[PDB]
Design an enzyme around this catalytic site. Sequence first.
Site, PDB file in Angstrom:
ATOM      1  N   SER A 121       1.237  -3.302   3.873  1.00  0.00           N
ATOM      2  CA  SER A 121       1.257  -4.671   4.369  1.00  0.00           C
ATOM      3  C   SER A 121       0.869  -5.609   3.236  1.00  0.00           C
ATOM      4  CB  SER A 121       0.339  -4.875   5.572  1.00  0.00           C
ATOM      5  OG  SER A 121      -0.995  -4.613   5.230  1.00  0.00           O
ATOM      6  N   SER A 141       0.792  -1.226   0.000  1.00  0.00           N
ATOM      7  CA  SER A 141       0.000   0.000   0.000  1.00  0.00           C
ATOM      8  C   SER A 141       0.826   1.279   0.000  1.00  0.00           C
ATOM      9  CB  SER A 141      -0.988   0.015   1.165  1.00  0.00           C
ATOM     10  OG  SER A 141      -2.028  -0.943   0.982  1.00  0.00           O
TER      11      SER A 141
HETATM   12  B1  LIG Z   1      -2.011  -2.071   1.889  1.00  0.00           B
HETATM   13  O1  LIG Z   1      -0.756  -2.661   1.968  1.00  0.00           O
HETATM   14  O2  LIG Z   1      -2.488  -1.574   3.258  1.00  0.00           O
HETATM   15  C1  LIG Z   1      -3.519  -2.463   3.651  1.00  0.00           C
HETATM   16  C2  LIG Z   1      -4.012  -3.104   2.452  1.00  0.00           C
HETATM   17  C3  LIG Z   1      -4.436  -4.620   2.728  1.00  0.00           C
HETATM   18  O3  LIG Z   1      -4.657  -5.358   1.549  1.00  0.00           O
HETATM   19  O4  LIG Z   1      -3.038  -3.018   1.482  1.00  0.00           O
END
Ligand SMILES: *[B@@]1([O])O[C][C]([C][O])O1
Length: 263
Positions: free
Chosen positions: A212, A45
């Site tokens: 994540s 993300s």
């Molecule tokens: B990003 O990495 O932050 C949370 C979401 C979960 O799929 O993606």
Amino acid sequence: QTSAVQQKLAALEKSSGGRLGVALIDTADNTQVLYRGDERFPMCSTSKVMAAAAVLKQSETQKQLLNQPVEIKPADLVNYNPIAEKHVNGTMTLAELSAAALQYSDNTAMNKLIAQLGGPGGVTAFARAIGDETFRLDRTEPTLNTAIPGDPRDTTTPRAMAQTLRQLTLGHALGETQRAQLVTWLKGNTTGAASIRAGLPTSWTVGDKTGSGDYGTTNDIAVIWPQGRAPLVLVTYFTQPQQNAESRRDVLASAARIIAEGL
Ligand SMILES: *[B@@]1([O])O[C][C]([C][O])O1
Ligand code: NA
């Protein structure tokens, strides 16, 4: 050769079981501290910063763009939709999608930003236009978070992402109102309390975006304003050998605590 900072980061990495990438830029003098700074890591993300910034850039010549409502249909929902799920069969504006993507890490919101840019390649094209020659976005949510060892899709390096975050928030890759808007969004993030922020003095102002993914991938990118000092940019990327590994936000906090010494 290595400095004591890099030696401490290597010891943290050894204890962690995984692979750690760090880039610090000190804007007082443009010096950089790097640890695996030119190795690729899955962005997860943290890539949402580039997508939101690309839409901000579009708005510099379409000045009402952030106000444009975008429909959210049931079929649009993916795996993590904390804000978008409140708007099914409704709408969110591009500003609201940007805030949700950045401040709650909403994945449906990110997919709408990607679509506004014409797909993952449009996000990459924006990166190239602002001088980031390293970033690549290849997939939409949620597959951009697979974080498979050796897979170059949806990766960047710590050095490149720190340089880009600097240009977007402290430099002038964006127009003046757009840069301020991005700073406001990052400062108001809700997902970062256990990551870089947990390793820095509480008196410092921080804007950040976490990431994540699979392989226990745990990331954070931040712009940092110490009270009486030029700002810093810090990227901490971390990924692990096991697909099923648990998150390790403490590793990012520990890396930040090391980096903060002497700043
Ligand atoms: B990003 O990495 O932050 C949370 C979401 C979960 O799929 O993606
Ligand atoms: Na939101």
